[PDB]
Ligand binder design. Structure first.
Ligand SMILES: *C[C@@H](O)[C@@H](O)[C@@H](O)COP(=O)(O)O
Ligand SMILES: *C[C@@H](O)[C@@H](O)[C@@H](O)COP(=O)(O)O
Ligand SMILES: *C[C@@H](O)[C@@H](O)[C@@H](O)COP(=O)(O)O
Ligand SMILES: *C[C@H](O)[C@@H](O)[C@@H](O)COP(=O)(O)O
Ligand SMILES: *C[C@H](O)[C@@H](O)[C@@H](O)COP(=O)(O)O
Lengths: 274, 274, 278, 278, 278
C-alpha cells in the first residue's frame, strides 16, 4: 500500500550521496546526509569506461551499513528484477532502478509492485515519471546528466516536468484524455497529478549537482531534495563539499547561509562539458 | 455507473440500421432490427459530397420515433458535446460519436462521462477502442470503410483488435506496461481487457457490410452484432436485404440458413473499390 | 489609456451578443428582427468569396448609408488587412466598429493597420494568443477567432478557441521569471502578456467567428468561454434565414440551457450545406 | 490425408480440360456444346470487372441453381479471398469446386480461407512456386496461374507458367541440405517442398488462367506443360463465342498438333479486342 | 522420428544444468568441481574472440581428447556455421553434442549444416521463434539464445528469451486459419509451428546463452522460463572463477530462491568487466 510513500516522506529536505566505500560513507554521515547510495563506481568514473555496470556486491553493502546509521540505498540495472530480489532479501532501505547502470532489459522496467522495498526511478518528463510510478516506483528523481558536474540537464528536467504539470492543470476535463495519449501516461495518475499540481510521490533532483548553489537552485524550483555523487568525491574538499551541500539544501532560501557555506570551499569537480 | 452497459447488453445478437426517414425506419422494424440509426444522409451518399455532415434535425428523430417501437439512435460529430447535450435532452437511446460526420474538434472527443445517454464509438485497433472507453463510451464498433460496401477494412479492424488482445494476453505481468505505452491506452483498461480476452464493452462490426455472408463473417470472428446502412437501402431489394442480414446475424453459424436467406436476394449495393 | 478604456467600455456592451454579416437592407432587417446586436456589412458573404478569385475590398460606403438608416442596431464593416486608407474613409463615414479581416484580400503583407490612430474601435482575428496580443498591441479593441470562414465547419474555430484559452491559463501558471522566454516564443509584447496574466483573460472582448452553422455550434463556442459570436454564411445560405438567425441568438443568450437549445433546433430546416474542402 | 487423396482423385479428371466462365444459362450451354469440362459461374466476366470500380462478390446462389439444372458438366464458383462464409454457403449449395479468386475484391488482406475445413475442393491462383505451395498448404486441391485476368493478353500467364516450372526443376536439382534456405527464400512449407521434389511436379493439378484469347494461346500454355486451361473473357467478348469456345477445347485436347491447331484457327473471327493497358 | 526422439531423450537430461566454455584441462576441472553438467571446448572463449580479427574455427580434436579423459561430465564443441566437414570430424571423434555457432566465423553464408545426417545432437542459437524453428527444421535437437556473446551484458539474451516466449504464447492463441500467414511471416515450417502450438512450448530443450556474468543474470534467465544456461566469458574472466562457477550452478538449480541467490552472490568477487561497446 503506502507505508512505502510514508517512508519516502521522511526524505524531504534531504541529501542522498553516492558512496563506493566506508570512508566515503562516513564522510556522508558526518555531512548530515539522510542516506547513502552504494555503488561499485560513482557516475563520473563510469563515463570514460565501457564496462558493464551492475548492482554492487551485497557484501559491500553490509560492510558499509554496519559502519554508519543513516539510510542505505543501492542501484539496480533497469529491468533486472533478480538483482532487486537479492537486495530486497538483504533488506535495503531503497532501490534505485537506474540508467547509470547498464540496462538489463531494453523494453521493460522492473515490476516494482512485486517488492516491499520502495523504488526510486529516473525521469526527464511528466509522462516518463508517471510511467515509472504506474510500475510501482514510490519516488522519482530527474536523470540530469550523471557525472558531468553540469547542472543544465537537471534544470531542464525539473522545469520540463513542472511546465507539463502546468499545461496539464491548464486543460479542461475533456482535454485531459488527448493529453494523456500524447504523454503516453495512465489517465488515473494524470488526473491525480492534476489534482495536486505536483507529482504524487516524492521527487528529488539528481545528476550534475556540483556546488551548494546548484543544490539550492533545484530546491528553489520545487524539488523535495537532492542526490549527489560525483560532485562530492571529485571535488577538492569532499567533507566540506558534502557539508555545504546539505546546509544549502536545508537552507535553500537563505542567501546568508548559501554565501557562508560557499566561501572557501575549494575547487568543485572539473566536470565535463560537450 | 453500468446500467449503461446493462442497456447495451440487450443489443447482443442484433442489427442496427441507418435510416434517413420513416419508410426506411419501418422497413427496418419489419426486418427485425433492434434499433435504427437516424441520419441526414446514409454513408454511401455522403461520399461524393463535400458538405458538412452534422447530427440530424431533432424533429426528424421525433417523427421517426413515434412511427416505430424499436430503439432509436443518432449520430453526433466528433467532439461536439452540445449536439450531444441537445439529443440527451431529447432522450435518445444511444449516441454514436461518429467519424462519418464532419469532425467538430480535431484533438478532443466528447467527454462521454457527462451524459446519462450511452455512447458508441468507432475504432480500428485496441488502443483506440480503449481510449474511447476511457472517455466513457459504453460500446464500441469498428469503423470499417463506411458506405463503400466493401467488407475488407471491417475485417482488418476486427482482427487487428483481436490479435492485439491476443498479444496482450501473451504478455507477462511486467511486459504489460511497455505495451500500454506503445498502445497509448490506460493501464487499468488494458488489464481488465487482458482479464477478459475481449473488450470490456459490447463490440459491433460496422462499415461496408453488404450481404448476409459479410454480416455472418463478422459474427464468426467474435463480434456481438452489426451496424448496416448503405448495404440495405442501396441494394436492389432493401426489405429483403434487411431481413436476410438480421437472419444471418441471428443464425451466423447456420450454413443452411445462410444459404436460404442468400438465395434470390437481388443485386447487393454496387459499392466502391479504389 | 483613456481612449483605450473608452473603447473597451464600448466593446463590453457587445458581450453576450450576435453580429451578423449582411449584403443588403433585406438581410439587415432579418438580423435586427432576430435580435442581433449588430450587422457587419459586406459586398459578399464569405461563402460567396470562397467561390470566386475576385479581389475582395471594403463595401461601397453608400451601402452602409442605405442599410444604416433602415436599422437601429450597431453597424460594422470590413477593411483589408493593412489598408489604413479604407479605414480612414469608414472612420469618416462614422461606423460603430471596423473588422480588419483576412476574409478580404490583404492589402499589405507585412503590416496591419495602426489601429491607435482611429477613434473607431477595431476587431481583428486570431488563431492563438501571440497573434491576438500583437493585434491588440497595434490597437485592436476586440478579438475574434478566424476559424475557417464561409465553410460552415466549426472545427478550426474550436481549435482557435481552445488554443488561446489554454495558452492564457498556462501563461497564468508560469513563474514570473519564465514569462520572458514565453513572450519570445509567442512573439508577443511582454506588457500585454503581464496584463493577461494579471486579468486571467484576454484584455479585450473575444468573439467566436468562422463556420458557425447551427445553434449547437454557437452554444459550443459560448460553453468554451467566448463572449459572443459572429455568423456570416450560416444564416443566409441556410433554408430558413429568419428562423436560423433568431435561434442562433437565443442559443448565444442561453448557451448553458439544453431545453432551450433543443427547443430552437427543432424543425429549424436545413443548415448551410458548407464545404469540407475536397 | 484420405480427404486430400479423395479430392486429388477428383481433380485429376479435369486434366486435359477447359473450364469456361459464364454469367447465364445461354453462355453455359455454349460452353457445354463446346466440350468444356466445366463452367465457372460469375456475376461478371473479368473483362467487365476491369471496367468498373464495383465490389465484386460471389454470385447469387439462385444463379448456380438455374444454370446447373440446364447443363450436365461440372459447376464451379468464385469466392472472395479470405471469405470463408461465402464458401460455407456454396459448400452448402453443393458445387463441384470453388475458386478463391483475386478477380473478386479481397475480403481479408492477411488470411486466405482455411480450405481444409471444406469437402469441396478449392482452386487458387499463383504467380510462383512459394505462393502455390502456400495455397496448397492452406488446403487448395488445385492451382492456376493468375496471369492478367480479363486483358486478353497472354504475357503474364506465360511468365507465371515458366517461373513455377523452372522453380520446380531447380528445386529438384538442389542438394538436400540446400532445400532449407530455399524453403525460407520461397517462404514455403518444407514438407510440401520435399513432396514436389519427390514428385518432380506440383503436388496438385495445375491450370493456365488469364488472358487466353485464341487457340494458339491455349495450346502454348499446354506446350509449357500445364494440365488445363481456364478461359473467361476470351470467349464471350470474341466475335463468334461458340466457335471460339469449341476451337479452344480442340486446341487444349490437341495442343501438340499443328494441323488441327491451324484448322481450328481458320476463319475463327475477331478475338477479344483486349486491353494492353495505357 | 525415432532418431529425433532418441536425441530429445538425451537432451532432456541437460534440463536444469549449466554448460561452461573451457580452453584447457585446468578450466574443465573447475567446471566439473562447480557442478556443470558439461563443458564446451574452445580454442578461445568469446570475450577473447571479440578482441581479435582472427578466423575462429572448431578446436583441434587433440584438445577434446586431452580434456575428456580428465573429466567425467558431458563434452561439447563448436563448429562453424555451415561447416559440415568440421562436424563430420567431431562426429567421428564422438562428442556428446555440437554447437553450430555464430561465435565462430561462418563457413557458409547461405546454408547451415544439415543436422539430420548426424547421430550427434546439435544445439543452435536463435533470436526469435522462426529462426529457432528453422534451426530445428534442419535437425537441431536443442536451441539457445544468441544474446551478445562475450560482452558480459545480459540485455540481448533477455530480449531473445522474451521474444521467443511471447511469440510462442501468441502463436498458441491464434485461430487455426491464422496460423498459415503467421508461418509465412516468421518464415517457419508450418508443421513445426503446429507442433509448438500443440506442445505450448518449443519442441526442444531451450537454453539461455550470452552475457551471463552473475548468478542474478543466470537466475533471471531461468525465471523467464529457460531450461538452462551456457556461460563462457563470465567465469574465467571473473576475479574468482571457481566461486563464480559454483555460484552460477547453485543459482540455476535454485533460481526461485532469494535466500540462496543472496547467499551465493555475497563476497563473490568482481564479475567480468565486460564490454558495453563504445
Ligand atoms: C469576418 C466575419 O465574416 C467572420 O464571420 C468570418 O471570419 C467568419 O464568417 P462565417 O460565419 O461566414 O464563416
Ligand atoms: C478466375 C478465372 O476467371 C480466371 O480465368 C482468371 O484468372 C482469368 O480469366 P480470363 O480468361 O477472363 O482472363
Ligand atoms: C556458444 C557459447 O559460447 C555461448 O555461451 C555464447 O553464445 C555466449 O557465451 P558467453 O557466456 O561467453 O557470452
Ligand atoms: C543514479 C544516481 O543516484 C544519481 O546520483 C545520478 O543520476 C547523478 O549523480 P551525480 O554523480 O551526477 O551527482
Ligand atoms: C457510423 C455508422 O453507424 C456506420 O454504419 C458506418 O460506419 C458504416 O455504415 P455502412 O453504410 O458502411 O453500412
Amino acid at each position: 500500500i503506502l507505508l512505502k510513500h510514508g517512508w519516502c516522506e521522511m526524505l524531504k529536505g534531504g541529501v542522498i550521496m553516492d558512496v563506493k566505500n566506508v570512508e566515503q560513507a562516513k564522510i556522508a554521515e558526518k555531512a548530515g546526509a539522510i542516506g547513502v547510495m552504494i555503488l561499485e563506481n560513482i557516475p563520473s568514473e563510469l563515463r570514460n569506461t565501457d564496462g558493464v555496470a551492475r548492482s554492487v556486491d551485497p557484501l559491500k553493502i553490509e560492510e558499509i551499513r554496519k559502519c554508519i546509521s543513516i539510510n542505505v540505498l543501492a542501484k539496480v540495472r533497469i529491468g533486472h528484477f533478480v538483482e532487486a530480489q537479492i537486495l530486497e532479501e538483504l533488506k535495503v532501505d531503497m532501490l534505485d532502478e537506474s540508467e547509470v547502470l547498464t540496462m538489463a532489459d531494453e523494453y521493460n522496467h522492473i515490476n516494482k509492485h512485486k517488492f516491499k522495498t520502495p523504488f526510486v526511478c529516473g525521469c526527464t518528463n511528466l509522462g516518463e515519471a508517471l510511467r515509472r510510478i504506474s510500475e510501482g516506483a514510490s519516488m522519482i528523481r530527474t536523470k540530469g546528466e550523471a557525472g558531468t558536474g553540469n547542472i543544465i540537464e537537471a534544470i531542464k528536467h525539473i522545469r520540463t516536468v513542472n511546465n507539463e504539470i502546468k499545461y496539464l492543470c491548464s486543460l479542461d476535463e475533456s482535454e485531459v484524455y488527448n493529453f494523456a495519449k500524447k504523454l503516453r501516461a495512465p489517465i488515473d495518475l494524470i488526473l491525480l497529478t492534476r489534482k495536486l499540481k505536483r507529482l504524487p510521490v516524492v521527487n528529488f533532483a539528481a545528476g550534475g549537482i556540483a556546488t551548494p548553489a546548484d543544490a539550492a537552485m533545484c530546491m528553489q524550483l520545487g524539488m523535495d531534495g537532492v542526490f549527489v555523487g560525483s560532485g562530492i568525491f571529485e571535488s577538492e574538499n569532499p567533507q566540506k563539499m558534502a557539508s555545504s551541500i546539505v546546509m544549502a539544501v536545508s537552507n535553500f532560501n537563505n542567501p546568508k547561509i548559501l554565501l557562508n557555506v560557499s566561501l572557501g570551499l575549494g575547487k568543485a569537480m572539473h566536470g565535463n562539458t560537450k
